[PDB]
Write a protein that binds this ligand. Structure first.
Ligand SMILES: O=c1[nH]cnc2c1ncn2[C@@H]1O[C@H](COP(=O)(O)O)[C@@H](O)[C@H]1O
Ligand SMILES: O=c1[nH]cnc2c1ncn2[C@@H]1O[C@H](COP(=O)(O)O)[C@@H](O)[C@H]1O
Ligand SMILES: O=c1[nH]cnc2c1ncn2[C@@H]1O[C@H](COP(=O)(O)O)[C@@H](O)[C@H]1O
Ligand SMILES: O=c1[nH]cnc2c1ncn2[C@@H]1O[C@H](COP(=O)(O)O)[C@@H](O)[C@H]1O
Ligand SMILES: O=c1[nH]cnc2c1ncn2[C@@H]1O[C@H](COP(=O)(O)O)[C@@H](O)[C@H]1O
Lengths: 349, 349, 349, 349, 53
């Protein structure tokens, strides 16, 4: 009569959450050469990227240099908001003013696309208006827990005010209900992931989290009937993880530590015992305008220097193309229908 | 026809036990600022704490200094019983005699609350009467296995004698039947956990134990219809574990090693190779009035020095407030209705 | 339509096998003091031991000294057969000829009980007749795979010849069908376990094995309706494992490496870097009359010196008594009805 | 209503994949002496090997020396194709021109059997015709993903041209549909495995793979009704793994790193700190005519020197014979009907 | 031998006899090995009215 895990409520434990390491992509009937696979995907309902990658809005990842490099590589960059509003507007203007790059993402005027991150509040409203005046293309309402009433209200206000000039992307969510609420508010895209890391600080300090594959599936289950794209944010460690995230229904993948150690990222290069490293910290870390209440909830560290951003982007795109060739996916929309096989702990040793 | 795990009896393996590491808290619709979350919770049916934390009744954790510090911090302390009765009564009197601490827990006379632990027997009866005369507020019938007839009889006798002056808390249980038996006996609260540690000595030496989340769920499933609070005792290592324990239905969490290394705990500070440590041993260890038959069943060790107790309590309360903000819980009674997501082994690496 | 693990046959994967680390004993209503628990159990249908432990028939574990010590401690010893028949008969006579030991196990003549191991064949028949003439009490038809026709025929022949003077115990089995076949042949007891070690050499070299808890459950499911006792052989590392094995239905536990490092075991003490060790090898190891076809299938090693055998036996019996007190089992027959809780991988860290 | 793993599609996660470490072979009624077990098995529909082992078609494993040694030992070798066509034809001729070896595999003319690997394309067609003229016995259409249209067309063309003189074996597959497609094309055997390694580069770079036991079961479920043998390729580390692969339905096992360190493999012996090692690289590694699009997808390394090939082959055959004796399998066709027991993570420590 | 060859008639032994069974102090077990305490008369842990101890 009772639940095998204890108690009487069958919904006390909602579901079993799968992460990236729990699944693999099953090969299927393939007539696709990896060199000819089309990797273009929607970022928002009106923006299509040639490479479905976006740089994280972190103070150690994305600034004007990284945003320009990402826009040239075929993706896009989202400028962080850990700085005064005027400085962020200057970064946006620097990106907008700047045959080598056939995959570059540009607006109708031939200028590189750029995105900016804003918070919630009146100061955030002033920041958003300043960024729109500076010529930003997409605004990301970046919050740790986007199912709050204030985040939805801010998204609705932004869509009412500058909804036709720029696009609005909702904050991080991890459930189907939150994604549906963001869609109802009027977001052009939904960013997915809350504590996706295995030892993420939210899971240790707060005991709150959600495995990324299940969260992506639930968010797609709420966003897809309305044509709202999904950006999987966090937890990606290899190109296989990017392929798994896109195969679960996500249209775009946002990259953090994978781009922190590149040469185009901010921060000074550090030398330790003959090796090269660069800093990497979360927006909720003690060292890190961060008016987020649920943003210590992060840690500082260093990642090895990796070199130019183009090499890393090419490696990730090659892995994605290999996955598309294995699954027989001519386009990303066909990769989003691939099947998974669940592996046990024995296959993770 | 046979059970898939072997044999013919479907109840030979009763259930699948989940521990703290097996579950995470799912985010929900939240309109709660973490700074404004109400963390007050019931300890017994008549005592409400501002911070739902209690110090363990261990000779290396709780004495008069630690009890006073815990009572000032918003929780309560339970004095150990590994000493003569007169000494414990003196500790109780010291605690009772003793704007910085707005969250302090006090009785109707303005004196700090304190709890004392007693065993089972005639000597334990004399100890309990002496402690009641000294002015103790709550008596904990501390036994390793509380489903014994003697423990229930002692609880009934204590409730008959001093049931209106003080409160009675039952010993450690791990099943629904034991919790129901304690409730029937007349306990004002039920303490939950039998071999909750991952490598606890009872699980290795005796092969007996129960995962803490399932035990909490079963005990709440028996205690809640009667309004009897639950104290999750053992296995907690982070504030996320405290949030998980309170979200499973427990009203109070009892802390051991998390408070052993503080400055308010007994024992002399030890210096090893430039670092600071303090002793920590179980009441069933060989080194450690311990008339408990099922109490070697413990080990000795040392834990790093952590500093003042207030800093640790503030860190734990901040983690709990972050969890409450994520789950949208204005009060602890609303946190007790949050949902869990079960994670696989891949998400624990 | 197909099986979720692949293929179309639902019986290709017979069952899910649980080991000792996968289960824990659930506490129950207990009125038993651990000091007064009765640990006596049946070894065969006619032999009752005061301590339900038996020494393994290995050339590095049981000889006359170890057999005498085990018989005095309350259990019994089974002499190995990796030596000439006359020497084994001499060992049996030495054991039989030999207020300190109130728990000693003795026959109707007041002499200590002893068991001997025999193989399969005409030479094994001569060995068995010699051992019976020497005064052995129980003969163990020791084979790695007892579901062979020859093993059953040998057991039947031994029961036909000397079935009234001595007892016959069948070799190692791991399935219900094999246990039923051994019971039909006429064995007085069934020894259970085939590749019970986690990294046992049979599981690596041959890929054959069975988890011990499931094997014990299935063998009891076939042996219990006829009153045939079960001896769990192999895989035991702690007293908790012994308690789990007895709670699964086994009446006796056979110990290997736990008794190898004792002072009563054969072999010369070895000194390495200030530490003490003794040799330990399997009967199927390369270094180790072993006409067993499926007995390299073993490895050599060394185990730390542990001291007198009585101390180890007392520690194991204390752990078993603690388990009996937790489960409320006055006798072993009541411990054999205790319930299990299955734990996940998170609870094994 | 929704799937417990997320989403609404119950087939998004197709199945649960078992690997070699997840299963064990259950003992059964055995009347088989391991020394008399018949290990002969079909390689193709017309070729029977005395030892069911085949050497991998890798540039660091199989050349003329290794092919001759394998053919003498009772198995067969498949020559790699990372070299000019004339050189491969010369290797085939060297193998064909070459009482010690009673188990040697020979054609009707008394010459050792040999196999060659070809790709897909017109150059591969010329290579295949040259190899057939040189006297090759079996052609392996070696592709990483054999469910492509071109691979099936090439297999059909080879069967149309030289289908009666030589045999054709399809590339690597991991699903039932791909095996059925290969059978329809006309392959004489099906090679099974796509990312079978636990940390295989395809699983990390591309996120694509399939556990080997489930893949073997599905491929057998499609190949067996037509009498098409199965060659399990990759993931084997011990003789127990070979026994498990043959018990899952596979008729032949292909060996890689287990044969790389032998003396008959190509490459110069390397000395490091008093130990002996030899190189080992995948055909998709950066260091390693490889016109395979989905073949960096591999890594380089070194394996310890193992000595003569005959010793390793005898060890593996002894392990297989032990498994056959445990399972009571007189022939490989009887081993292919054995049952498995699934073990938890606790049994893998 | 060197001390006696230099002219000394007797040798006084310290740590060479501290670890023996006849010396005071309780036997200590560490990681499977046996040890015994040994401290100088001028050590912090160690009636010692010696000014230059
Ligand atoms: O301090 C923090 N705590 C938690 N999440 C953070 C923090 N800072 C950034 N994030 C988010 O977590 C993601 C981690 O990306 P990753 O390092 O690629 O997994 C970032 O891209 C942000 O979306
Ligand atoms: O010797 C012992 N064995 C087992 N449990 C003990 C022993 N001493 C105390 N305990 C209990 O186990 C808990 C462990 O707390 P923790 O160290 O915070 O997990 C204590 O708070 C006591 O309730
Ligand atoms: O070489 C061997 N291989 C496999 N089993 C063995 C070997 N030698 C003895 N055994 C059996 O396996 C048991 C292992 O006992 P344990 O070491 O206590 O688990 C022994 O008591 C024997 O019954
Ligand atoms: O670079 C590579 N990547 C992936 N698979 C490979 C590569 N080279 C060879 N293989 C295949 O994977 C198998 C691995 O064999 P193993 O090392 O015995 O597991 C080989 O026998 C080939 O069939
Ligand atoms: O604390 C101390 N400091 C210095 N010398 C000491 C101390 N205690 C004893 N001694 C002397 O130093 C000698 C050391 O002996 P040894 O350890 O055999 O070299 C002793 O026998 C005493 O004569």
């Amino acid at each position: 009569v009772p639940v095998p895990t204890g108690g009487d409520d069958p919904t006390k434990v909602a579901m079993l959450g799968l992460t990236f390491d729990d699944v693999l992509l099953l090969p299927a009937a393939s007539d696709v050469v990896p060199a000819t696979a089309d990797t273009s995907s929607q970022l928002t309902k009106r923006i299509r990227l040639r490479v479905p990658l976006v740089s994280s809005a972190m103070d150690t990842v994305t600034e004007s240099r990284m945003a320009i490099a990402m826009a040239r590589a075929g993706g896009m960059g989202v400028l962080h908001r850990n700085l005064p509003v005027a400085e962020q507007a200057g970064q946006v203007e620097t990106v907008k003013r700047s045959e080598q790059f056939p995959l570059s993402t540009k607006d109708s005027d031939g200028r590189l696309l750029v995105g900016a991150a804003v918070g919630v509040g009146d100061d955030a409203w002033t920041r958003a208006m300043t960024l729109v005046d500076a010529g930003v293309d997409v605004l990301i309402v970046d919050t740790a827990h986007a199912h709050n009433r204030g985040v939805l209200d801010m998204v609705s206000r932004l869509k009412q005010a500058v909804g036709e000039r720029v696009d609005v992307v909702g904050g991080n969510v991890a459930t189907r209900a939150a994604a549906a609420a963001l869609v109802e508010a009027g977001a052009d895209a939904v960013k997915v992931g809350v504590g996706p890391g295995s030892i993420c600080t939210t899971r240790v300090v707060a005991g709150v989290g959600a495995p990324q594959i299940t969260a992506i599936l639930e968010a797609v289950a709420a966003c897809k009937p309305y044509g709202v794209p999904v950006i999987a944010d966090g937890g990606l460690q290899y190109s296989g993880d990017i392929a798994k995230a896109l195969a679960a229904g996500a249209s775009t993948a946002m990259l953090g530590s994978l781009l922190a150690g590149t040469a185009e990222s901010p921060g000074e290069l550090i030398f330790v015992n003959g090796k090269q490293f660069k800093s990497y910290r979360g927006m909720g870390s003690l060292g890190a305008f961060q008016d987020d209440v649920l943003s210590p909830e992060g840690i500082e560290g260093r990642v090895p220097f990796r070199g130019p951003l183009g090499t890393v982007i090419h490696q990730l795109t090659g892995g994605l193309r290999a996955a598309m060739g294995y699954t027989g996916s001519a386009t990303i929309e066909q990769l989003q229908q691939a099947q998974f096989v669940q592996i046990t702990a024995a296959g993770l040793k």
